[PDB]
Amino acid sequence: SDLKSPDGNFLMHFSLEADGTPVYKLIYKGKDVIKASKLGFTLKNDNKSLLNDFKIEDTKTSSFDENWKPVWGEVSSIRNNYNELAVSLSQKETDRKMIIRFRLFDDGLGFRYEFPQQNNLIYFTIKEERTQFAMAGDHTAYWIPGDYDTQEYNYSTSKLSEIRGLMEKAYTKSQTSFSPTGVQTSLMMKSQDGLYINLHEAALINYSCMHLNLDDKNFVFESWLTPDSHGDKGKMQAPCKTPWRTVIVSDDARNILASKLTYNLNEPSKIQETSWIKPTKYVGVWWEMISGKSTWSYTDEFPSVQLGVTDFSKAKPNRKHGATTANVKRYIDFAAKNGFDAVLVEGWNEGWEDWIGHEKDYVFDFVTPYPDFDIKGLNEYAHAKKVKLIMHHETSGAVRNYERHMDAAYKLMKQYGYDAVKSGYVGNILPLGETHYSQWTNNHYQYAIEKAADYQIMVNAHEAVRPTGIARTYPNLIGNEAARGTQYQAFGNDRNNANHVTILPFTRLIGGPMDYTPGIFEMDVTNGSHVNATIANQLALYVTMYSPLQMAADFPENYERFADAFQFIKDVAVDWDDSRYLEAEPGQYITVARKAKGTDNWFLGNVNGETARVSNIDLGFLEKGKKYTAVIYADAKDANYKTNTQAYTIRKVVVTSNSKLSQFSASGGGYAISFYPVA
């Protein structure tokens, strides 16, 4: 019946209502966080469903406290410490068995449903999941519109009661909305009385992606899963279980960011030997096309292309193509010179003339280079300079087409020494009517990952479902996008709000890292769009947007122009033995310092929102009795993300654990700091 966090700060009461509805309640430090909340499911072609009429057949309690070592991460060792309540339910009349399993951590609550092997529930279909989160009042939320096909929205900050009226505008126009009060997870909130509340899920395997629908009379969120192509919300087979649903809570917003709860609820690694999994700093032939300077395509001779018919070797080059042998060489040369691990190349393969908007099945083959891209020479050239290429497999939504070519594509990767692939799923999923985050498409992303692992290939999947901690289980999933990235800074309209990167950690990053592609130095790009950041904001992102996969997205020539600033990007690590969140408020600021794996050096970043601010940090995370050379890369006092983006200062100062530092950060600005011991 009742359950406590190890530290006694959380209490979860579970009971049944008069009619047999199962309900839960969560309490933090004597405060209601989750009020009485119903659980269970509406099932298709089922009189009675799984909503009510249960009895408690048994309860079982236990405790767990172990550490595991991530392959890559924010810390060298993570603590998995919880108390567990398993409630076995039995429904009257049907005698169907449903377990609700709760784990209560010092960071908050996770729960899931289990269906054991039984006689009167075998194959069933979920019409709707009926999992509630009753809020204590009209909290502030940081939210994106509920959508079955994209998460690439700017966040809105508002009360819960304002979501309805704001939904006309926040839903900017592959996308499918569902409700005027529907929102995605991870969802971040802050109560009128200073509690930070995160609703999300963990271990999204073999199940549809959960969104939340708000009842804005009573402030109750309810699970609203993603329909597949037939409109269903889970083809289930017992014995089976749901992903966990997570309520991470703290009176200190920094603890939300530091939580490993999401990972903790996923199964331990299923990869036995993990040393081939290598955190990666990279450049690429990428932003050129994103910002309208180059094309993915080789030719414009043809209205459409047909692979195996169009003869590319005899087509007129349009001469805008980014992925030329000469251009890739330049990026290789730049990566090698500056200690980067890899270079991504997009537009390398036949088919880019028809990549977007055509709902085209046989859109790519994932193996055949354009005539102007010498796959063999370039891979040899890169390896000779101690660099790798990153394979790119945009699918343009044609999932069957990808699965058929996948083995051959991974083989070709291995044959030329590619160990990582950036995938994509742009456009409607084929065949039309399918959604990007259904149980059905979710299984594709899962299969891609699993198969990549069999080849010892790493995967970074754009346009896929947002992560839910599955990289603990498959640490070859070194990234996704699955949110609005730097690319939108090049797409005109509103680009990304100045405070975007002060919300992403509190939402999107819960579940796993993002390939945000930071590192922009020229904010006014070829197609006229204005990147809403300062240079110092861009340097800070290598620390404030944690990821084992970190791009420097701008052109070689722009880094050359601002070589002094670029030093931080060259110096910063991408893997860590420890991390300390120093300051954080969603929508406003994040400051964090991290200690580079296998070193005694630290790197710090600050990102700042709309309101310019003076940050004051304690350098207590440094080792006692040591001196460090700090180099501080900061906004100039008149820097500004709209009108003065390229104004930064660089200064050196020797510091100790007892030093304090005070730093202006501009509007949409930030700062970065390297700390190296003195010898």
Ligand X SMILES: OC[C@H]1O[C@H](OC[C@H]2O[C@H](OC[C@H]3O[C@@H](O)[C@H](O)[C@@H](O)[C@@H]3O)[C@H](O)[C@@H](O)[C@@H]2O)[C@H](O)[C@@H](O)[C@@H]1O
Ligand Y SMILES: OC[C@H]1O[C@H](OC[C@H]2O[C@H](OC[C@H]3O[C@H](O)[C@H](O)[C@@H](O)[C@@H]3O)[C@H](O)[C@@H](O)[C@@H]2O)[C@H](O)[C@@H](O)[C@@H]1O
To the nearest 10°, report the CA torsion of 269, 274, 277, 279. Answer: 80
Question: Applying CB under 5 A, which residues contact Ca ion?
Answer: 462
Quick one: which of 130, 360, 500, 595 contacts a second copy (CB under 8 A)? 360
Q: How far apart are CA 225 and CA 430, in angstroms?
A: 20
152 scored as a contact of ligand X (CB under 6 A): yes
Q: Closest CB to ligand X among 368 and 644?
A: 368
232 scored as a contact of a second copy (CB under 8 A): yes
Quick one: which of 147, 354, 372, 481 contacts ligand X (CB under 6 A)? 481
Quick one: which of 59, 67, 192, 237 contacts a second copy (CB under 8 A)? 237
Beta strands in 359-512 (DSSP E): 388-394, 420-424, 458-461, 477-480
Q: How far apart are CA 143 and CA 501, in angstroms?
A: 13
290 scored as a contact of ligand Y (CB under 6 A): yes
Q: Are 51 and 42 in contact (CB under 8 A)?
A: yes
What part of residues 281-300 is at the interface with ligand X (CB under 6 A)?
286, 290
Beta strands in 194-296 (DSSP E): 196-202, 210-215, 220-225, 235-237, 240-241, 244-250, 280-285
Question: Tokens 């309805």 label which residue?
Answer: 164
356 scored as a contact of a second copy (CB under 8 A): no
Rounded to a whole number of angstroms, the minimum distance from the CB of residue 119 to a second copy is: 6
Instruction: Look up residue 531 and give its amino acid.
Output: V
Which of Ca ion, a second copy, ligand X, none is residue 360 near (CB under 5 to 8 Å by kind)? a second copy
Quick one: which of 68, 171, 178, 302 contacts a second copy (CB under 8 A)? 302
Q: What mask of x and - would describe binding to a second copy in positions 372 to 411, judged by CB under 8 A? A: ----------------------------x--xx--x----
Span from 284-292, 330-338, 568-576, 628-636 in contact with ligand Y (CB under 6 A): 284-292
Q: Closest CB to ligand Y among 201 and 394?
A: 394
Span from 203-211, 485-493, 547-555, 569-577 in contact with ligand X (CB under 6 A): 485-493
Span from 300-308, 338-346, 410-418, 419-427 in contact with a second copy (CB under 8 A): 300-308
426 scored as a contact of ligand X (CB under 6 A): yes
Q: How far apart are CA 324 and CA 637, in angstroms?
A: 42
Q: How far apart are CA 191 and CA 135, in angstroms?
A: 9
Q: Are 612 and 635 in contact (CB under 8 A)?
A: no
346 scored as a contact of ligand X (CB under 6 A): yes
Residues contacting residue 679 through CB under 8 Å, at least 6 positions apart: none
Among left, alpha and beta (phi > 0; psi -120 to 50; other), residue 480 is beta
What are 481's strand-pairing partners? Answer: none
Q: Closest CB to a second copy among 137 and 431?
A: 431
Residues contacting residue 543 through CB under 8 Å, at least 6 positions apart: 572, 592, 593, 594, 603, 604, 605, 672
424 scored as a contact of ligand X (CB under 6 A): yes
Q: Closest CB to a second copy among 117 and 415?
A: 117
Rounded to a whole number of angstroms, the minimum distance from the CB of residue 175 to a second copy is: 17
Q: How far apart are CA 105 and CA 256, in angstroms?
A: 13
Q: How far apart are CA 663 and CA 636, in angstroms?
A: 10
Rounded to a whole number of angstroms, the minimum distance from the CB of residue 446 to a second copy is: 12
Taking CB positions, which residue lies at the least distance from ligand Y?
394
Residues contacting residue 467 through CB under 8 Å, at least 6 positions apart: 204, 477, 480, 482, 511, 512
Binding site for ligand X (CB under 6 A): 150, 152, 286, 290, 346, 394, 424, 426, 462, 481, 487, 491-492
By the criterion CB under 8 A, which residues form the site for a second copy? 117-119, 122-123, 228-230, 232, 235, 237-239, 302-304, 306, 358-361, 400, 403-404, 407, 431-434, 440, 443, 447
